[PDB]
Amino acid sequence: HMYEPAGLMFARCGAHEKALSAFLTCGNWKQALCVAAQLNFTKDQLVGLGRTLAGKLVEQRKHIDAAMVLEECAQDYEEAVLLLLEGAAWEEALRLVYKYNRLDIIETNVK
Amino acid sequence: YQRFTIDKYLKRYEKAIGHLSKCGPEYFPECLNLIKDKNLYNEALKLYSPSSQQYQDISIAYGEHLMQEHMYEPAGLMFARCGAHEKALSAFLTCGNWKQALCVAAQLNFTKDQLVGLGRTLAGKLVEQRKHIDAAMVLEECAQDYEEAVLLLLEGAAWEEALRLVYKYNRLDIIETNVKPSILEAQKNYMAFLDSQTATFNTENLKDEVYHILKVLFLFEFDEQGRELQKAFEDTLQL
Amino acid sequence: LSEVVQNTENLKDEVYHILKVLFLFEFDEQGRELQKAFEDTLQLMERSLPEIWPPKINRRTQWKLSLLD
C-alpha cells in the first residue's frame, strides 16, 4: 500500500502537516508536486518529474496531467494537443494552437 | 416575376426563392426580406450552397436572429462566421453565453496584448455562473498575479481539494493567505451543516467527496475532527 | 440488458459537443447521421423498457443542435 496515505503522511511525517519530504511512492499528481515543490529539491528544469507524471496519469486515461505539467515544462504543447485529441479535449487543443500559433496542424490530423 | 408570382400564389415559396436566386441579384434584397421576415432563411441556405457572399450574409442573419436571448452556442458561432476573425465583428460573447467567451479566449488574438477587460468580464461571468474554472488561464491571463488568483480561488473556495496554487510556499504563506484558517472555517461550517441535515433523517455525492476531501483536514493537525464529521457520513449509512 | 442500456446513455453530451466541433468544419451531414442513429437506438430502448418491466434514465440530457437539426 505505497499509495496516497503512505506517501501522504510521509510528506507529513505523521499528523504534522509537512514534517518530512524527499519521498514519494507513485506521485498521483498531488504527492508528487507536494514532494517536488515543498522543500524544493529539483525544479521542473529537471523535467523528469513532468515526464513521469505525464506517462503515469496518461496511462491512467487522464490526459490532463500533461496538459497541466507541460505548461510548466518545455513547449511540447503539440504533444499536449495530440493527447487532448486522443482524449477528445478539443477546445484545449484549440487554445494551444491559437496561443502557440501552431496553425499548420489546424486540419492535418484533427479533422 | 411571372413564374415567381405563380409560385407565391400556390405557395411554392421554396421554388419561388429558387426562381428569385436563379433570376439574378435584383431579387436578393426581396429574397432576403422574404426568408428572414418569416425566418425561412434556414431552408434557403440549406438549399443554397456556400459559393457566394450571399451564403455568409444569410448565415450572419441566421446567427443574429438566433442570438436574441439564446445562450445557444451555434447562434454565436454563426454570428461569428464573419468579422475580423472567426469570432464575429463584435464580441459575440456579449450575448451572455459563457461558452462564447471561452471560445473567444480560446482561439485567436483580438488586438489587445492581454485582453484585460475580457478577462475581468470572464471572471465576473464565471462567478455569476458559480463555475470555478476561472482559476486557470482565465485568471492567468488578465490577473497574472499568483496572489490575486489564489485569493479569487479562495472566494471560489475550491481549496478543500489541494489546488495549492502557491505550490507549498512558492510566493506566500498558508496562514498568511488565510488558507488553513479559511479551510478550518469552511470545514467546521460544513461539519455542522451535515449534522443538521442528518438531524432530519442524494447525499451519495458527499459519500466519497468529503471521504476524499477528508485529507484537507487530515493534512492539517485536526485528524481527530475527521470522525467528528464522519459521524454524519456514518449516519446516512443506516437509511 | 440493463447494463447495455446504461452503457448507451453515457454519451449524450459527448456526442452533443462533438457535433458542434465537427460543425466548425461543416460536417453537419455526418453529425446528422450520428444524431439519427443515436435517436433511433434511444427510441428502441425507450420502447423496450416497458416491455422488460430496472433503472430509470434521465430525460434532461441534451445531445441535439438546431443547425444539426
DSSP string, B137-155: HHHHHS---HHHHHHHHHH
Chain B neighbors of A34, CB-CB under 8 A: 162, 164, 168
Q: Which helix (H) or strand (E) is B99 found in, with range?
A: helix B98-106
C3 within 8 A of C45, measured Cβ to Cβ: no
As given in the structure block, the three cell numbers for residue A50 are 513532468
DSSP letter for B131, please. -
B99 residue type, one letter? K
Query: CB distance from B74 to chain C under 8 Å?
Result: yes
Query: CB distance from A98 to chain C under 8 Å?
Result: no
Which residue carries 488586438 as its cell? Answer: B111
Q: CA angle at residue B119 from B113 to B122, to 5 degrees?
A: 150
User: DSSP readout, A41-73?
Assistant: -S-TTSTHHHHHHHHHHHHTT--HHHHHHHHHS
Contact call for C65 and B78, based on CB within 8 A: no
In this complex, which chains have at least 3 CB pairs below 8 Å with chain B? Answer: A, C
As given in the structure block, the three cell numbers for residue B174 are 498558508
- Report the half-sphere exposure of B136 (CA within 13 A, side-chain side): 14
- Phi/psi at B63 (nearest 5 deg)? -60, -45
As given in the structure block, the three cell numbers for residue C55 are 433503472
SS3 assignment for C35-49 = HHHHHHHHHHHHHHH
Query: CB distance from B50 to chain C under 8 Å?
Result: yes
B44 within 8 A of B61, measured Cβ to Cβ: no
Which residue carries 497574472 as its cell? Answer: B144
C68 within 8 A of C19, measured Cβ to Cβ: yes
Chain C neighbors of A109, CB-CB under 8 A: none
Contact call for C21 and A90, based on CB within 8 A: yes
Count of CB atoms situated within 10 Å of the CB of B84:
11
DSSP letter for B162, please. -
| Distance from C-alpha of C59 to C-alpha of A7, rounded to nearest angstrom | 44
Restricting to B residues 157-176, those with a Cβ less than 8 Å away from any Cβ of A are 162, 164, 167-170
In this complex, which chains have at least 3 CB pairs below 8 Å with chain C? Answer: A, B
Closest-approach residue (CA) in chain C for B77: C24
Query: CB distance from A17 to chain B under 8 Å?
Result: yes
Contact call for B219 and A15, based on CB within 8 A: no
Chain B neighbors of A94, CB-CB under 8 A: 106-107
Chain B neighbors of A38, CB-CB under 8 A: 168-169
- Phi/psi at B93 (nearest 5 deg)? -60, -20
| Distance from C-alpha of C16 to C-alpha of A37, rounded to nearest angstrom | 40
Which residue carries 514534517 as its cell? Answer: A19
Restricting to A residues 77-96, those with a Cβ less than 8 Å away from any Cβ of C are 88, 90
| Distance from C-alpha of A66 to C-alpha of A63, rounded to nearest angstrom | 6
Resolution (A): 4.2
| Distance from C-alpha of B190 to C-alpha of B225, rounded to nearest angstrom | 12
| Distance from C-alpha of A83 to C-alpha of A72, rounded to nearest angstrom | 16
Which experimental technique did the depositors report for determining this structure? Answer: cryo-EM
B118 residue type, one letter? L
